[PDB]
Design a binder for this molecule. Structure first.
Ligand SMILES: [Br-]
Ligand SMILES: [Br-]
Ligand SMILES: [Br-]
Ligand SMILES: [Br-]
Ligand SMILES: [Br-]
Ligand SMILES: [Br-]
Ligand SMILES: [Br-]
Ligand SMILES: [Br-]
Ligand SMILES: [Br-]
Ligand SMILES: [Br-]
Ligand SMILES: [Br-]
Ligand code: NA
Ligand code: NA
Ligand code: NA
Length: 273
């Protein structure tokens, strides 16, 4: 990988991953010997389950494999239904206190989650058409994982996030608004989490991100337009919340997130001329 500080993100450290040793080069969600706590952001489904294909399926696999090692009986179907129930409940609570981090009651049982939070920057569907961007867009969840499903048994791998990105089929104007809102929810939820009691003990020191909306959600939208939305949304979210953590972009052979940030960086260099 290559790591640089971006002036257009107020000096935030960004790590751009190259191809991994794995088939297809995909970046692992969690590392075997991390020296800081990097929360990886699931490109979630509108229906809020952990499962299915792509990156969301890789999160399911990671959690299911750790559970199996610990002798926890947890099927993919149980994980899908459970994570959906938890996150539906968090979404309901978050919509009732929009723009605030909300926490699920600690009395709720979970085989995977020790503590769970939700955040909507604005009520989904209030400022855009759900028929265009899709349901539940902009919600981000933060989960502290139970030790028994924490990758490598390493405490620095005990936080995941889960975010619902807009559909690429939406018109440009509303897509840009929904996308910027979504990135605000990602950075804002993590920054807010770091101001909770749980976050004092387990601070998030980096985010590991895909290009959100860049998989099956993009439909016929160009990766270029999505990289531009990500660069603008990330710049704005960092201006709002001033997070201390670094950003990492998982390997993408299109380099779409990278290209969006490169364009914004050069523009920033020229902003006084
Ligand atoms: Br690797
Ligand atoms: Br490592
Ligand atoms: Br849905
Ligand atoms: Br399933
Ligand atoms: Br709102
Ligand atoms: Br909605
Ligand atoms: Br917002
Ligand atoms: Br807390
Ligand atoms: Br996607
Ligand atoms: Br944009
Ligand atoms: Br922070
Ligand atoms: Na759905
Ligand atoms: Na599945
Ligand atoms: Na996504």
């Amino acid at each position: 990988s290559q790591t640089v500080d971006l002036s257009c993100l107020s000096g935030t450290t960004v790590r751009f991953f190259g191809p991994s040793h794995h088939f297809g080069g995909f970046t692992p969600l969690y590392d075997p010997a991390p020296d800081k706590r990097v929360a990886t952001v699931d490109a979630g489904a509108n229906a809020l389950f952990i499962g299915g294909g792509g990156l969301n399926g890789q999160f399911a696999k990671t959690l299911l494999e750790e559970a199996e090692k610990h002798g926890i009986r947890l099927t993919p179907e149980e994980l899908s239904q459970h994570s959906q129930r938890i996150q539906q409940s968090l979404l309901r609570r978050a919509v009732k206190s929009p723009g605030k981090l909300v926490e699920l009651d600690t009395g709720v049982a979970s085989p995977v989650f020790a503590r769970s939070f939700g955040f909507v920057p604005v009520v989904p569907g209030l400022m855009w058409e759900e028929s265009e961007v899709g349901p539940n867009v902009g919600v981000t969840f933060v989960h502290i994982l139970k030790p028994e499903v924490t990758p490598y048994g390493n405490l620095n791998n005990n936080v995941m996030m889960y975010t619902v990105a807009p559909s690429g089929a939406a018109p440009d104007k509303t897509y840009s608004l929904a996308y910027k809102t979504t990135i605000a929810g990602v950075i804002g939820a993590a920054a807010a989490y770091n101001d909770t009691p749980a976050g004092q003990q387990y601070p998030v020191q980096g985010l590991r991100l895909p290009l959100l909306g860049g998989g099956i959600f993009r439909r016929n939208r160009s990766l270029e337009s999505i990289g531009r939305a990500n660069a603008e949304g990330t710049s704005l979210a960092i201006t709002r919340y001033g997070p201390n953590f670094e950003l990492q972009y998982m390997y993408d052979p299109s380099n779409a997130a990278l290209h969006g940030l490169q364009e914004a960086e050069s523009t920033y260099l020229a902003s006084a001329a």
